[PDB]
Design a protein around this ligand. Structure first.
Ligand SMILES: Nc1ncnc2c1ncn2[C@@H]1O[C@H](COP(=O)(O)OP(=O)(O)NP(=O)(O)O)[C@@H](O)[C@H]1O
Ligand SMILES: Nc1ncnc2c1ncn2[C@@H]1O[C@H](COP(=O)(O)OP(=O)(O)NP(=O)(O)O)[C@@H](O)[C@H]1O
Ligand SMILES: Nc1ncnc2c1ncn2[C@@H]1O[C@H](COP(=O)(O)OP(=O)(O)NP(=O)(O)O)[C@@H](O)[C@H]1O
Ligand SMILES: [Mg+2]
Ligand SMILES: [Mg+2]
Ligand SMILES: [Mg+2]
Ligand SMILES: [Mg+2]
Ligand SMILES: [Mg+2]
Ligand SMILES: [Mg+2]
Lengths: 516, 516, 516, 47
C-alpha cells in the first residue's frame, strides 16, 4: 500500500533537524566573520554570468552567494533587516545569530530542552535592550563633530584606508541637508552618482542633482548662473482633445490656416514659459522640435523626456513645483540653482544643477579610478549615510570596538545569577554569545582573543569603563569614546533583537520536511 | 543532510585567493609588457569570427582578448580608465599594477599582513602624487612647439616609424582648433575618418567635416566656394497638422486647386531658404522631389536624410543653427565654409565641408595603403590627441623614457626611510615597483636592464637630473627633456593612482567564491 | 596549466578539516549512544544481501554498518580494540571518544590551539589512569561470588531480561575451568556452540567438547562411559613410502600375497590401537573402510576426517596427545571423559565428549527458540566471558552505573586546578567529558540527566561514596558496589586510554586530502 | 585553477609568430606568382 507523506521528500527529525539548522546557521555566520572590523578581509564573488563583486559588506556578500539552505536563508534575513533599518552592522547581526546557535547547541547537548533555551534567550534579549538604553549616550542631531565620528567609524569598518575625514564630513553635510520637518532622514534623498576619475579623493557633494541629459538644442546656453528653473509634467507639444476630433478641409487656403494655428499654439506655450522668468526648463515628456527652436530663440535652456525620478529630485533640490499645465506656470513655481551647466564627466555629457541654497535632495558624486574601486567606496558611503541618519533620528550612540558587547555580557551574567534553575544556563549562554564580536574583532587583527577578552573584561569590572575596548590598531584596551570609535545605539539594538528573534524561531524547530 | 553553501561553487581561501589574484594580475600585465615603448612589439588578435586586430595599443589588446578571469578583469579596468582619462599610458598603468601585485607577494610570503601592505601602498601612492606635482614642468597651453613634442613622443610609443613631424603638427592643429571656452578639450570634437589611399603620409586635417552623402540632384552644383550653409532638422515636405485632418472634395475643379496649393507651399519653402542667402542646405529628413527640383533651379546644393550626428558636427564646424521651421530660417542661422564640394575619395562620393573659419569640430582624414595599416595609424593619432589635450588642459608635463619613474622611485625610498614598522616594507616595495617601467623599456630594446638601471639611478642621485633616462635609440642615458621625449603629468598621475587603487582592492581579498 | 595536486581530489583545511573529523566522530558515537546501559535499545541492521543482525552490541553495530567516512573509521578502531582487549564496554569507549571531540570543539571555537587541547587531553588521560588504580577494588581470582556479579552486571548491560543467575554461574564456571597454569584466560578455549531449542534457559556448560561428526560405522557403540580416547593425526590407511615405489608381479600367486599383506597391516594398526586401551578414537585423516570394520569388531568408537580445530580442542579437553605414528600410540597418550555419546541435537547428529575431570577447554552450549534470539544471547555470553576473564587476570574491579566516571571526573577537576594557563581548559574539558556515561545511562532510563548528575556528584563530594551511582532500576542514587553492579577495572582503563589516544590523533589533523 | 587567458585559444609567440606570418604571406604570394606577366597562366576557381 502507498505512503502517506510524499515519497519525494527528505526529512530530518529531532536532533538531526536541530543540527541541520544550527550547522547551516553557524556556517553562514562563518563565511562573513573574517570580514568583521577594520582589519577584516574582503570577498570576491563571481556569478554564473561571470560578473564580479568585491566587497567587505556583510549583507551584500550574503545576497550574492546563492544560498539555498532553508535555515541559512532564515539568517540572511537578519542581515537584510539590519541593512533596511540601520544601514550598518549587517555582519555583526549575523555573527551574533550564528553564535547564539552555537551556544544553544552546547545546551541541547546537555539535555536542556528547546523551549527553555528559547525562554532564557528571550529574557536575556529583553534585559539586553534595557541595558542598552542605560549604556547609550545622548547626542544632538546637529552635533557635527559627533556625527563625523559616527561617519568615520562606519567607513573604518570597511578599512582604515577608506576613512578620509573629508569624505566623512561630506557625508555628514549630505545627510544634514535632507533632514525633514519631522527631523527624519530619508536615505533616498541622497542621490548616489558613480563616475570614474583621477582618484577616490575627487568624490564630492553636489547641492543639487545630476541629470543624464543634454540640452535639447545646441543653440541654447550651456551654462547658466542663478538659473530660474521651470519643471513641467506635460509635453510642450500640440495639445489634442481627449474626445476624438477631426479637421475637415474643403477650402485649399485652410491648410495653411490650420498649420499656422498649430505653430501659434507652440509659440504661445513658449511665450507663457518665458513670462514666468524661467531661463531653464526640464520637461518630463516631449518638446516639439518647433518649440525647441522657440525656446532656443528666447535663450531658454531645456531638456526633454526627463525621468520622473529626475523631475522629483529636481523639485526637491531647487524648490520648484512640477507643473502640469503650461497655462498655470507662474514665477512662484520656479526653482533656483546657483549653476546649471551641461558638461562632460568621464566622457558623458550631463546637466549639473548645483549650488542650490537649501536643497531637500542632494547628490554624492563618487569618484575613483575603476568601476570596481568605486562600487566599494559607494557601499561604504551608504553605511555611513545610514548611521549618520540613525544618529540624527535617535540622538543616541554607544562606544564601539566591541566595548558595548563586553559591557552587556558582564551585566547579563550578573542578571543571570538571579534566574532560577535551567533557564539560567540559557541566559548565561546568550551573555557569552555577545562576546563573539570583541573576540572576532581581535582575531581578525591577528591578536590572541582569549587574553584580549580577559583584559577588556577587567577594564569593565568593578564599576569600570563601559567604553573600554581593544583598539585593533594600537593593540591596547582603550576608551573607545575618547578615541571617537562610536556607533548609533540602533546598530546594537537592531542586531541583537534580530539575532534573538530569528534564532528563537530556529530553535523551536524539531522537524524539517523538504520537498523535491 | 544538505549542503549550506551552494554545491555548484568553486572556492579559494587565504593563500590560494591571494595567489589566484596576484597571478592573474601578473599574467595580464605580462601579455602587454612586450609592447611597451618604441622598441615594443605588436599583437595580432583573431576573434571567433576570424576578424583581425593588429596593434601595439595596450587597452585595445586587453579588450580584444576575451579575458574571463575575475581578478584579471579588475586589472583591465585600469587600462580602460587610463584610456578614458588620459588616452595614453594604458600599458604603463597595467604593468605597474602587475608589478605592485608581484612585490606584494614577496611581503605576504615573508609574513606581512595584507592590511599593512595596503596601508603602505596607499601612503606611497599619496606621497607619489605630491612628488609628481613638484617634478612636473610648467608649460603653456598655446606653446605649439611643446605640444608637438608631446604628440611626437606619444606616436613614438607605437614605433618611431609612425612618428612623422607633419603628422604630429597636424594633430596639434586639430586639437588646438577645438579647445573650448573653459579651455577644455573634448576629443569627440575631432572626427576620425579612415580612407585607403596612396600612403599613410596623405593623412590630412580638414578644418570642417566629411558627410557620407551625395547631393540629391545632379542638376545642383558639385562645388560651392564661400558657402552659406542652411541646417534644417525638419523635412522639406508638405506639413501635416498634428490634429488629424482630411481634405473633402465635392467639386472636380477643386482637385487641381489642392494639388497646386501643395506645390505652391513647396515653392514657398524653397523661396524662404533662398531668401536667407543660403546656397547649401543639409536636411536631417526628407525633401520632396518637387522641392529638390526647385532647389536645383535656384542653384542650391542640398543633401537629405543627413544623420543627426552629422547635422550636429556640421553646426559645430560651420557656425549654423539647426532650424526646425523653415519659416524661422534667417540669414543669421547660416553657417560658413570656404569650400563645399561633393567628390570621390577611395571610390566613395562624399560631401566635403572644408576651410571653415573657426570650426569647433574638425576632421582628421587618415590615409594609408590598407585597412589594417590605417587602423593602427588611427590608434596612434588617438593616443596623441589624448595627450595633446591633457597638456593643453593641465599645463604640466614630465620627462619620458622612464626617467620620471626613476626619480619617483628614488624619492619614495627616501620617504620610506622615515616610515616605522612593517609598513616601511610596503612603501619600499611600491618604490621598487615603479622601476618596472624603465626596466621594461630597456628589456624591449634588447639592453641589459640591471646595468641600465644602475646607470639611470646614478644620474638621478646627488641631486642630479630628474629628466635623465635611457634613450632606447641612443643606448645612452640622457636628459630626456632636452631630447624632446616628454609626456603629460596626467599620464603618470592616472597610471600610478589606478595601479595603487585597484591593487589595494585586490590585496584585501581573502576569499574567492565563484558560482557555476 | 597544469595542476600540481591531482585534479580528482576533495580537500578540507583548517576549520573545515577539524569540523568534518569532529562531526564524523560525534555522529558515530550518537549512533550507539541509545544502546548504552540496561535501558538501552537495539538496532536491526540489514546488509545488501538482506541478512539481518539484531543487537545491543556496540562494536558489532559499528562493524555491520558500512561506514566509509575516514574519521569515523578512526573511531571504530576504538570499539575493536575494546572488544579485543576486554570484550566489554565497546559502546562506552566510542561514546567517551565522541564526547572528547565535542568538548574539544568548544575549545577550538575560542581559539585554543590543537596542540594545547592534545596536551591537556594527554595529561588528563595519564592522571585518570593513576586515579583509576586507587579507585579500583582488589578481588581474588577464586572469588566466585564476585566473578558472578561481574558476569551478571555485564549481561545486564544488554538488558535485565538476559541477566539470569544460572547463566552467570555457568559462565563463571566456564571461565574458571580454562584458566591456565599462569593464571591467564584465553577466551578461545571456551567453545561456543549455538543450537535452537525449547528455551534460552536450556543453555548449559559442557565439561568437554561437541564434535560435528558421526561415528564411522553404525556397528560401533553409540554411547561409552569412562571412555579412553585416542587422538591420531595420521591416516588409518595403508602406508606408502615417500620415495616412488612400484610393485612388480610376475607370479599369479603373488597377487593375493600383496593384497593379504595390505589388509594384515590394516588389521595390525587396529590391534595397535586396541592394545593401547583406547575404546574411542578421533582421526584427523581418513580411516580405510576396512579398518573401520576392524575398529567396529573390537568395539571401538571412531570418527574420521576430524578437523584440526576439534582435534586440538579434544586434546585440551581430555588431555590426550594427538599422535602422528600409530606404532607410537601408548596408553599414556589416551584422554579420558565420563561420557562419549553420539546424539542428535536439534536434528543434528553430533559426538558429545563430556564430564571430563579437568578440561583445559570447555563448551558453552547456547540454546534459544530462534537463530536470531540465540545470536544475541551468544553476544551477551561473550561480554561476560570477557570481563570474568579480565577480573581473573587483573584482580581489580570498579563500581558501575557511571559511579566511577563521576568519581574520576570530580578528581580530574581538582587536578585541573593546579594546571597553569590554557591547558587547564583542556584538562577540565576531559573531566567533563567522562560524565557523558552517567548522563547517557540516565537519558536512556528516561530520567532527567541534569538533576541525576547533580545528585550523584553530591554523593561523591567531600569524602563521599566513590561507588555512588544512579540505579536505573530504582531511580535512586545508591551504592553500586553494595548493589553488586561492578565491572573490571580494565573496561575503564582501556576505554579511556583508547578514547584519549584516538581523539588526540584526530585533533592533530588540519588537512584532509581525499582521492576519487 | 583557473586560467587567466581563455582556455579556447591558440597562441604563437616570438619566432613562431614571425614564422606563421611570414609563411602565410609567402604562400599567398606564391599562389598568384605563376600568373605574372604575358606568359603567366590562369586559375580556375570553383566555389
Ligand atoms: N578603530 C577601531 N578599533 C576597534 N574596532 C573598531 C574600530 N573601528 C571600527 N571598529 C568596529 O568594527 C565593527 C564594524 O566592522 P564591519 O566590518 O563594518 O562590520 P559590520 O558593520 O557589522 N558589517 P557591514 O554591514 O558589512 O558593514 C564595529 O564593531 C566597530 O565598532
Ligand atoms: N625616444 C624614447 N626613448 C625612450 N623611451 C621612450 C621614447 N619615446 C617614448 N618612450 C616611452 O615609451 C613609453 C610609451 O610606450 P607605449 O608602448 O606607448 O606605452 P603606453 O603609452 O603605456 N601604452 P599605449 O596606451 O598602448 O600607448 C613611455 O614610457 C614613453 O616615455
Ligand atoms: N543496574 C545498573 N544500574 C546502572 N547502570 C548499570 C546497571 N547495570 C549495568 N549498568 C551499566 O551499563 C553500562 C554498560 O552497558 P552496555 O550497553 O553494555 O555498554 P557497553 O558495555 O559499553 N557496550 P557493549 O560492548 O555493546 O556491551 C555500564 O556502564 C554499566 O555499569
Ligand atoms: Mg560596517
Ligand atoms: Mg552596507
Ligand atoms: Mg603610448
Ligand atoms: Mg590608444
Ligand atoms: Mg556491555
Ligand atoms: Mg560484546
Amino acid at each position: 500500500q502507498p505512503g502517506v507523506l510524499p515519497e519525494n521528500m527528505k526529512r530530518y527529525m529531532g536532533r538531526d533537524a536541530q543540527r541541520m539548522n544550527i550547522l547551516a546557521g553557524r556556517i553562514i555566520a562563518e563565511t562573513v566573520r573574517s570580514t568583521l572590523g577594520p582589519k577584516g578581509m574582503d570577498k570576491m564573488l563571481v556569478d554564473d554570468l561571470g560578473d564580479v563583486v568585491v566587497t567587505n559588506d556583510g549583507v551584500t556578500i550574503l545576497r550574492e552567494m546563492s544560498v539555498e539552505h532553508p535555515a541559512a536563508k532564515m539568517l540572511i534575513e537578519v542581515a537584510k533587516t539590519q541593512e533596511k533599518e540601520v544601514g550598518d552592522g549587517t555582519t555583526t547581526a549575523v555573527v551574533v545569530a550564528g553564535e547564539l546557535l552555537r551556544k544553544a547547541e552546547e545546551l541541547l547537548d546537555q539535555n536542556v530542552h528547546p523551549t527553555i533555551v528559547v525562554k532564557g534567550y528571550q529574557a536575556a534579549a529583553q534585559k539586553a535592550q534595557e541595558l542598552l538604553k542605560t549604556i547609550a549616550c545622548e547626542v544632538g542631531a546637529q552635533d557635527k563633530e559627533i556625527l563625523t565620528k559616527i561617519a568615520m567609524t562606519s567607513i573604518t569598518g570597511k578599512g582604515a584606508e577608506k576613512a578620509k575625514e573629508k569624505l566623512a564630513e561630506i557625508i555628514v553635510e549630505a545627510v544634514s541637508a535632507v533632514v525633514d520637518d519631522e527631523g527624519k532622514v530619508d536615505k533616498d534623498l541622497i542621490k548616489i552618482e558613480k563616475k570614474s576619475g583621477a582618484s577616490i579623493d575627487d568624490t564630492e557633494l553636489i547641492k543639487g542633482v545630476l541629470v543624464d541629459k543634454e540640452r535639447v538644442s545646441a543653440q541654447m546656453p550651456k551654462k547658466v548662473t542663478d538659473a530660474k528653473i521651470a519643471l513641467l509634467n506635460c509635453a510642450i507639444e500640440i495639445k489634442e482633445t481627449e474626445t476624438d476630433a477631426e479637421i475637415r478641409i474643403t477650402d485649399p487656403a485652410k491648410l495653411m490656416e490650420f498649420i499656422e494655428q498649430e505653430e501659434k499654439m507652440l509659440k504661445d506655450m513658449v511665450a507663457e514659459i518665458k513670462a514666468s522668468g524661467a531661463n531653464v526648463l526640464f520637461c518630463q515628456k516631449g518638446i516639439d522640435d518647433l518649440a525647441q527652436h522657440y525656446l532656443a530663440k528666447e535663450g531658454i535652456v531645456a531638456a526633454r523626456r526627463v525621468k520622473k525620478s529626475d523631475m522629483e529630485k529636481l523639485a526637491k533640490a531647487t524648490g520648484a513645483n512640477v507643473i502640469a499645465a503650461i497655462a498655470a506656470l507662474s514665477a512662484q513655481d520656479l526653482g533656483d540653482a546657483g549653476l546649471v551647466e551641461e558638461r562632460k564627466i568621464s566622457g558623458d555629457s550631463m546637466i549639473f544643477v548645483e549650488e542650490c541654497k537649501h536643497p531637500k535632495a542632494v547628490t554624492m558624486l563618487i569618484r575613483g579610478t575603476t568601476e570596481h574601486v568605486i562600487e566599494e567606496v559607494a557601499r561604504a558611503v551608504d553605511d555611513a549615510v545610514g548611521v549618520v541618519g540613525c544618529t540624527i533620528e535617535d540622538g543616541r550612540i554607544v562606544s564601539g570596538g566591541g566595548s558595548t558587547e563586553v559591557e552587556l555580557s558582564m551585566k547579563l551574567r550578573e542578571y543571570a545569577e538571579g534566574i532560577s534553575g535551567r533557564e539560567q544556563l540559557a541566559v548565561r549562554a546568550f551573555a557569552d554569545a555577545l562576546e563573539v564580536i570583541p573576540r572576532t574583532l581581535a582575531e581578525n587583527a591577528g591578536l590572541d582573543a582569549i587574553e584580549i577578552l580577559v583584559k577588556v573584561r577587567a577594564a569593565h569590572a568593578s564599576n569600570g569603563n563601559k567604553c573600554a575596548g581593544l583598539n585593533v590598531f594600537t593593540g591596547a584596551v582603550e576608551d573607545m569614546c575618547e578615541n571617537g570609535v562610536v556607533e548609533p545605539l540602533r546598530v546594537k539594538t537592531q542586531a541583537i533583537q534580530s539575532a534573538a528573534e530569528s534564532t528563537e524561531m530556529l530553535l523551536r524547530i524539531d522537524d524539517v520536511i523538504a520537498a523535491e
